[PDB]
JSON list of N, CA and C in Angstrom, two decimals:
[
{"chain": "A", "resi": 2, "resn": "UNK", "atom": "N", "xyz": [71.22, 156.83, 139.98]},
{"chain": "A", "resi": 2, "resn": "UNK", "atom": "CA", "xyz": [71.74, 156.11, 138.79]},
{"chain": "A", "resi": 2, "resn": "UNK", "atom": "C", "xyz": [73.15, 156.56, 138.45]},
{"chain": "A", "resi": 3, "resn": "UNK", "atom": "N", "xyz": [73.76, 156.94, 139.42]},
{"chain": "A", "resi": 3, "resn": "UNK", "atom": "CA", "xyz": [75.42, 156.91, 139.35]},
{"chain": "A", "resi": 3, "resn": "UNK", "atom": "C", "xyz": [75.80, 156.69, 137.94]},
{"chain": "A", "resi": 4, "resn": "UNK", "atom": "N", "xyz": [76.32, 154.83, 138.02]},
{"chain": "A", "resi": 4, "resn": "UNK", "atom": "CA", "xyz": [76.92, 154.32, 137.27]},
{"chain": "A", "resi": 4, "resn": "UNK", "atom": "C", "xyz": [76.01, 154.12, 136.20]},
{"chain": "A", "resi": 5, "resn": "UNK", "atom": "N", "xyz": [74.28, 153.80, 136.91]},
{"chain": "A", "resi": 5, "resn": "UNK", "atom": "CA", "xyz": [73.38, 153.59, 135.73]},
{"chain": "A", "resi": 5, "resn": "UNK", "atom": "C", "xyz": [73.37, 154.00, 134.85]},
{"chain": "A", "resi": 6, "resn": "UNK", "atom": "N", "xyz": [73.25, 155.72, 135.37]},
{"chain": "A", "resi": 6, "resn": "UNK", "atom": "CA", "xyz": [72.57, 156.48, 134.23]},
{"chain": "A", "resi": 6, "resn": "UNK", "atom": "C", "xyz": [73.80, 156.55, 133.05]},
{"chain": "A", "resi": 7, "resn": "UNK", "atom": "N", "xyz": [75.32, 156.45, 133.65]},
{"chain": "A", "resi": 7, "resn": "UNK", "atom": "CA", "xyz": [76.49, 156.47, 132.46]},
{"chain": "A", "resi": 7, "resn": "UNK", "atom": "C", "xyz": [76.17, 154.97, 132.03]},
{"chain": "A", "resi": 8, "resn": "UNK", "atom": "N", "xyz": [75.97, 154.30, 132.86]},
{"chain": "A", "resi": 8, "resn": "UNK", "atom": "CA", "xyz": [75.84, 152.80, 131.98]},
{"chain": "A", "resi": 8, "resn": "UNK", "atom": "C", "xyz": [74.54, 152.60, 130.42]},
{"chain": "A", "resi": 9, "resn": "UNK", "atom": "N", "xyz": [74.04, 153.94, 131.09]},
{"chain": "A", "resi": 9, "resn": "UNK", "atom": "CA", "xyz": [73.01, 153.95, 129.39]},
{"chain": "A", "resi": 9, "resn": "UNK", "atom": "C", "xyz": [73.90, 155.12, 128.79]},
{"chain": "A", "resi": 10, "resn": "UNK", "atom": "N", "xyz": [74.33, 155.50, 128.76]},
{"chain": "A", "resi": 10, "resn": "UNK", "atom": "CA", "xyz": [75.72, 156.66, 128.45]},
{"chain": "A", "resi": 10, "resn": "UNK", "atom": "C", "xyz": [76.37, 155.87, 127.62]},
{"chain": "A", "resi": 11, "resn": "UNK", "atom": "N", "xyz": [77.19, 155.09, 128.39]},
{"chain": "A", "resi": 11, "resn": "UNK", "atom": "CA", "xyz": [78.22, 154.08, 127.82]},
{"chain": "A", "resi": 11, "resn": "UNK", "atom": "C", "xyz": [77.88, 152.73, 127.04]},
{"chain": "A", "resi": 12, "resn": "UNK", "atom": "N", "xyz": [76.72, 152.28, 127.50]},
{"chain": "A", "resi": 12, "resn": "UNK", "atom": "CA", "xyz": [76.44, 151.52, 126.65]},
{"chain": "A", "resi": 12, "resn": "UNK", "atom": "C", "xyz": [75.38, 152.13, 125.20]},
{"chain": "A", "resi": 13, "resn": "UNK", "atom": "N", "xyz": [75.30, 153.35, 125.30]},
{"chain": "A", "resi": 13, "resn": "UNK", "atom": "CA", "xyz": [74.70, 153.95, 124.42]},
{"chain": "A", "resi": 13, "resn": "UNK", "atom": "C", "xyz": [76.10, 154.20, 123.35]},
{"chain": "A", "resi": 14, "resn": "UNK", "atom": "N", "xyz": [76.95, 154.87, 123.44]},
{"chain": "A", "resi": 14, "resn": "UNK", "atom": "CA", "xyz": [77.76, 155.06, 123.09]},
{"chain": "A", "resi": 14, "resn": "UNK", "atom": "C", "xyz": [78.81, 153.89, 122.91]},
{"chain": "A", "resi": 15, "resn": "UNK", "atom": "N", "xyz": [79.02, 152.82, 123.42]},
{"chain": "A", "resi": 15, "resn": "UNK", "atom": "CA", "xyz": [79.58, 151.70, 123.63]},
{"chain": "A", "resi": 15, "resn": "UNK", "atom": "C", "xyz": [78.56, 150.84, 122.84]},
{"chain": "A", "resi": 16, "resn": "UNK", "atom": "N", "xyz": [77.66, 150.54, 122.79]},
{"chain": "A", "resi": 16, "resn": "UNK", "atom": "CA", "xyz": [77.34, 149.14, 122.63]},
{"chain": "A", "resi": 16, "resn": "UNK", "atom": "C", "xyz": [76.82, 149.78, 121.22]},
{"chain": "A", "resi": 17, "resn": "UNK", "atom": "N", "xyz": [76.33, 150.85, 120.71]},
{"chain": "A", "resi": 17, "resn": "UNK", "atom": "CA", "xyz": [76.38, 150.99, 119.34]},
{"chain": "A", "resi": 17, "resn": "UNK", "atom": "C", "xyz": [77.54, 151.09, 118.17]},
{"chain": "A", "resi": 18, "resn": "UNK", "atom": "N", "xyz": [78.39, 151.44, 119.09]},
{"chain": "A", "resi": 18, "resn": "UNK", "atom": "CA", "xyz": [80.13, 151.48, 118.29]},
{"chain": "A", "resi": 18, "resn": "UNK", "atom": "C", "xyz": [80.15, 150.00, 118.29]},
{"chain": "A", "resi": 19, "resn": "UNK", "atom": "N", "xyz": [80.39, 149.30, 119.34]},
{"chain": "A", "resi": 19, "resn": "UNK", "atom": "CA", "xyz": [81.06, 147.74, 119.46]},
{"chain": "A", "resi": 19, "resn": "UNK", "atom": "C", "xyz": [79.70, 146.92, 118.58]},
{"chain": "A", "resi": 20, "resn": "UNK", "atom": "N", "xyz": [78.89, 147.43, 118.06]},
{"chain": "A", "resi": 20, "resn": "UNK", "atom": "CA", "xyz": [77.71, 146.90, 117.24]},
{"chain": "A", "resi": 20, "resn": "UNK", "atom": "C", "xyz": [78.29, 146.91, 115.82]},
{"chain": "A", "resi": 21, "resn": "UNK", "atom": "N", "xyz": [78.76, 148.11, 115.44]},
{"chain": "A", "resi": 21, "resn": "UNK", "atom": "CA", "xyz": [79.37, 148.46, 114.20]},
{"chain": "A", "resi": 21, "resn": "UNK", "atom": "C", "xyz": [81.23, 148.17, 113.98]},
{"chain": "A", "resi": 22, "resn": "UNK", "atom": "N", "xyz": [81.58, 146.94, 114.71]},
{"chain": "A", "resi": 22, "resn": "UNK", "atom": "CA", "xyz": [83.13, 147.09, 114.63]},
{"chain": "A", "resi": 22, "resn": "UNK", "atom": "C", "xyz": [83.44, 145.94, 113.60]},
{"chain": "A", "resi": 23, "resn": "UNK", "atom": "N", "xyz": [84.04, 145.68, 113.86]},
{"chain": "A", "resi": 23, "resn": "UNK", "atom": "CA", "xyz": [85.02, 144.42, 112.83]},
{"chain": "A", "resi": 23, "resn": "UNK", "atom": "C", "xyz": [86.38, 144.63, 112.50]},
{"chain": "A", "resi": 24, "resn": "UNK", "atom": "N", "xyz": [86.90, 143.44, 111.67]},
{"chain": "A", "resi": 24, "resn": "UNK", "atom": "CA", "xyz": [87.95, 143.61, 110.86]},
{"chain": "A", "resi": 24, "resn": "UNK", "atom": "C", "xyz": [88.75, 142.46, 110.13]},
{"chain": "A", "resi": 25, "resn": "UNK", "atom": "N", "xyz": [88.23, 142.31, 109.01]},
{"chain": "A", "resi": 25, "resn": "UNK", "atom": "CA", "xyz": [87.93, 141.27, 108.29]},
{"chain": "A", "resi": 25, "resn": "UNK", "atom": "C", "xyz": [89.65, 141.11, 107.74]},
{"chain": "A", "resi": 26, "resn": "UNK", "atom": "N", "xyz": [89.97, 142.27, 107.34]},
{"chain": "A", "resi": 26, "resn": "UNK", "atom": "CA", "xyz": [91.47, 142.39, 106.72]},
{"chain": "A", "resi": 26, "resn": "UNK", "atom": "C", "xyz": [92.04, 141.25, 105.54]},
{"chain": "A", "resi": 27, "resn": "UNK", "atom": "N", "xyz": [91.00, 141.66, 104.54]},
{"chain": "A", "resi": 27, "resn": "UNK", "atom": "CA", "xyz": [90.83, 140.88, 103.31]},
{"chain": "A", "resi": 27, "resn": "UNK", "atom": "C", "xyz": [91.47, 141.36, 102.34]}
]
């Protein structure tokens, strides 16, 4: 799992950040 195991790495770390982003700039 090479890339796998960073791909639950990164999308652990990645896909919970990019879950919480935005920017409304109101």
């Amino acid at each position: 799992s090479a890339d796998e195991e960073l791909e639950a790495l990164r999308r652990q770390r990645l896909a919970e950040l990019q879950a919480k982003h935005g920017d409304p700039g109101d």
